[PDB]
Every structure is written in C-alpha cells, then in structure tokens.
C-alpha cells in the first residue's frame, strides 16, 4: 500500500499534488498543464511546441548561459514535453535542491524573454526537426493516423505544425498563447519522491501566486471529434520493414468504458520477436504471429483524449508477402472480442492489468507523471483500490458489448508505411471487421 497523494489548492486555483517516498533521495517536481497543440488554430499551429524551445532560451533575469549554469549547479536536470492535450515541465533534483528547481520552473514559465533574436535562431532548429522525424517511423505512422482519423479537426494537426507557421511565428503570438492557456486553474504543481507536501505548497505560494486565473474556470480535464474511416499509404519499397497502424475511434479518459477498453486491449496484447518470453504468451494473436513469423512486433494501444480516443494496433513486419495474413489474423482476433470472448480471456487480462497499472510506477518521474496525468485528465488521483474495483467490475459481457458497438463492422483508420504492396485496399481490410460466419 503506497503513501497517500496529498492535494492542496492556492487562491488563484493552482493545484499542488504530492506523493512522498522517504526511501529515495531524489525528487521530481514539475508543472502539468491541461493545454497542448489542440488549443492552437490552423494559423498558430506549432506555437506550443515553439514555446517549449524558447522556455529554455533565457528569462527576464537569467540569460540562456546563466540558466544552463543554474541547472548544472543544482546537479539534476530539467525536461519538458508537449503533446496534443498536455504540456509538462519538470525538474529532477536532489532532496534539498527542490526549492531551487521550483524557482527555475516558475521563472521559465512566467517570465521568459521570447526575444526576436532567439525566435529567429530556433526557427531554423525547428525547420530541421521537420526533416528528421522522417526517420522515427512509429512517430510518422501515429502522426498520419491522427491526421486521417480526425481529418481537418484540431486533434488531426501535428505538434510541430506546418513549415509555413514555423517561418511566421512571432513573439506576440507566443505570448498570447501562453497567456490564454497557461492559467492557474489549468496547472498542477506535482512533487514525487523526497518532497514534503507542506514545503511544496509554501514554494507554490512563493513562486506561482501571481499566475492569472482564466475568465471561465472549467474543471481539470474538460474538453466534437468526428472520426473518419480512411487510409494513408506511404509506400516506400526501399524500406525493409513495413509499419502499419489500424485504429477505430476509442474512449475518452472519463468514458464509462475506459476500463473495458483497456481489458479488451490486454486480450490482444503486445508481441516482440526479440523478447524471449514473447513466443510463450497466452494471447491468440501472439501465437499465430510467432508460429507463422508474420511480424517483428505488434503493440495494442488504447489512447485517450478528453472527448475521444483511438483504439487499435501497431504492427511492424519484414514479411512483405504475408502482410495480408498478418492483417487478416489481427482483425479476426478483434472479431472474437465480439463473438467468442468468455470469462477465460477476460479474467486472464484483468489479472495482468491489476498488476500492470501499479508496476508502471517504478520511479519518481513515473509517479509524478501518473499524478500529473490523472490530475489534468480526471481532476483527481484515483487510488489503487478504486482502480482495482473498476477493473473487477469488467465482465465478459461488458467486453463483448463494448466490442460489438466499437469494433464490430466499424470504419477503421489505417496507415501503412514502407513495403506495403501486399497491404490490400481499404474495402478488403475493412471487410475483416466482421465475420460472415457470425
């Protein structure tokens, strides 16, 4: 039984949430923001990502060089990432270096220079990032998957944004973005590891007290996405490995089917030929794939957003003449979530998840990420007891009912990259989303 997550508020509406661990000597503190690329329009798409670069380019007090020195002197590091709905800025340090790190974070968020000289310098760095993500095949596949599934909608935009916007982002629009979105009621200061809650709340009162509140304070994790069945093919015969993602519209964070979708995802599970245990996994798809050498790997996912999600699978394969078999058998395993799953598969997957959801949290950064994600998507940290109860309530009837409305005979979003000549047209893939025998 893990220590309780303590939670306090400030007057502006900033949440402070902490989980102490007197067994470790380091602490991760940071700011989880309920804002990301989704909050941009088509004209300033890329702003959120751009700001993340400029946040470390110098403040009203410390210059870029001074900033570097300050963090180096603390001894730990700083890290940041921007997604579609969430921005994070955190600092891993020693126990007694926590007040320094909170001070640095408050400074880069509230009092960043955004000087025209630095904007112009980063404009080239970010331009180069456009031509180097091309190598990260999984990211390419998932960015195209969002682009097609949420065609011409805010969730369909990339985080980097288009080349055109990168050349036209001004300090004005940067300042406007962070003034509108980085408000206290959308921010959570999170501490995990060697932190005292009462100390963290004092530091928050010292550094984050002059944060603007938004005009209309909605609860944390408050959002209409219209999924498009569609495909993107990025054929490249020179690549040896095909990368394929297939997804349907999934579930949001607060869906009533949230846990049912996770259990269904665990029944299919993951596979990797490089891991020794993977040939012995219980998953039917895993057995088909390993026995027939159909793939190098597959990973089931159930990605959630505030008002929608994507549920599906990501496959990698060198077997270019049996891509048809791989996709065929994958979708036939999905069909069985509607037609055949019983207490056998469901209880097994629940057993695996009950542990998995706790296992994931194995260091201070993981714990801080968990607190921050849950507070910014649900508005609370869900205790392991509540999670154990919600998982226990998932029955085989629930999985079958969920699959029959979410998977069975539904439109998919499909992305293929690489030697995908063997991937059949949309209709033949989508026809595998039902069984004529049932």
């Amino acid at each position: 039984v893990s220590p309780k997550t303590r939670t306090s508020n400030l007057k502006n509406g900033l949440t402070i949430a902490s989980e102490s661990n007197p067994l470790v000597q380091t602490a991760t503190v940071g700011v989880w923001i309920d804002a990301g690329s989704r909050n941009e329009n088509a004209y300033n798409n890329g702003t959120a990502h751009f700001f993340e670069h400029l946040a470390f380019k110098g403040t009203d007090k410390r210059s870029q060089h001074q900033l570097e020195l300050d963090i180096e002197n603390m001894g730990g590091h700083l890290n940041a990432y921007t997604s579609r709905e969430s921005t994070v800025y955190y600092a891993k340090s020693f126990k007694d270096d926590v007040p320094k790190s909170v001070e640095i974070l408050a400074d880069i968020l509230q009092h960043s220079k955004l000087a025209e000289s630095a904007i112009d310098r980063e404009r080239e760095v970010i331009t180069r990032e456009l031509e180097e993500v091309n190598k990260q095949y999984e990211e390419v596949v998932f960015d195209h998957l969002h682009a097609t599934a949420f065609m011409n909608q805010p969730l369909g935009r990339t985080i980097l944004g288009p080349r055109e916007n990168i050349q036209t982002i001004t300090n004005t629009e940067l300042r406007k973005f962070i003034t509108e979105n980085y408000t206290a009621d959308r921010m959570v200061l999170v501490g995990a590891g060697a932190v005292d809650h009462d100390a963290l709340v004092e530091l928050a009162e010292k550094y984050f007290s002059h944060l603007p509140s938004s005009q209309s304070p909605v609860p944390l994790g408050t959002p209409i996405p219209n999924f498009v069945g569609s495909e993107v093919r990025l054929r490249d015969d020179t690549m040896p490995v095909a990368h394929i993602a297939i997804a349907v519209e999934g579930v949001s964070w607060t869906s009533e089917d949230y846990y049912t979708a996770l259990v269904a995802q665990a029944i299919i599970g993951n596979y990797d030929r490089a891991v020794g245990t993977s040939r012995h996994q219980g998953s039917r798809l895993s057995n088909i794939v390993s026995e027939n050498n159909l793939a190098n790997s597959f990973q089931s996912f159930s990605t959630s957003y505030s008002d929608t999600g994507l549920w599906g699978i990501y496959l990698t394969s060198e077997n270019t003449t049996q891509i048809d078999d791989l996709v065929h058998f994958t979708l036939k395993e999905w069909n069985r979530l509607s037609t055949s799953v019983s207490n056998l598969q469901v209880e097994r997957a629940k057993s695996q998840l009950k542990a998995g959801l706790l296992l994931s949290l194995d260091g201070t950064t993981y714990v801080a990420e968990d607190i921050g994600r849950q507070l910014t998507t649900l508005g609370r940290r869900v205790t392991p007891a509540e999670v154990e109860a919600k998982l226990e309530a998932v029955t085989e009837h629930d999985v079958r009912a969920w699959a029959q409305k979410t998977l069975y005979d539904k439109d998919i979003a499909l992305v293929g990259l690489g030697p995908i000549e063997g991937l059949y047209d949309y209709n033949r893939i989508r026809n595998d989303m039902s069984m004529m025998r049932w």
Partner: protein, 124 residues
Amino acid sequence: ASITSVVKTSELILKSPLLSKIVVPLAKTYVKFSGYRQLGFKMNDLIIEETPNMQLALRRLPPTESYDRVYRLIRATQFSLSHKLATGNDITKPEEDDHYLIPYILDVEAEAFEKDALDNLEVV
C-alpha cells in the same frame, strides 16, 4: 495416435508384472514377423513424419543421427524397388534398433499438449 499415448500405455503395461509377462513376448514376435529389420530400418524410421510435430522433432535430431537416417531410408528404398532383403551388416540387429527419435518427439508433444491445456486455463 500420439507418440505420447503409445509410450504411456506401454509404460502402464511394463509396470504390471502379469501384463508384461504376456505382452513382451508377443511384442517381440510381432517385431520379428513385421520384418522391417530385414530392410535395415530401425523402428523409429517408420513413424509417419508428415506432421508439424514430427517435422519439428526431425529438425532437432543431432546431425549425425539425421544423416544416418537419410541413408537408411535411401537404402531401404533401394531394397524395396529391387525386391531384395538386407543381408549381413545391413540387417538391423535387435541391439541396434534404438529409439533415437522418441525423446525428441515426446518433448515436442509435451510442449504442444501443455500449450493446449494452458490455452484453456480458468482463473479461479
């Protein structure tokens, strides 16, 4: 029938004193009249091989055993087409009729059968 079944049933018989006393002499006569040794075969050379399990067990044979089995099949095929029997050293002596393949196929089948059982496990 699975090799596993045959081996286990045989072991039940060999345990029972009465049963072994009556079955072992019959089995030895059977093998003499079977006459596979007169084509230079070992008993295991006759087992049906066109199954996934058997193809796996044959791939696991040590290379030497595998090369010798190939030769015995080719040699028996040549006796068969000529309507001749082995003579001299080509005849398999009872002491040479070793179960070289049985351990490999029993391991293949043990895994296959455990996989089937475990595919049907119910969390209690």
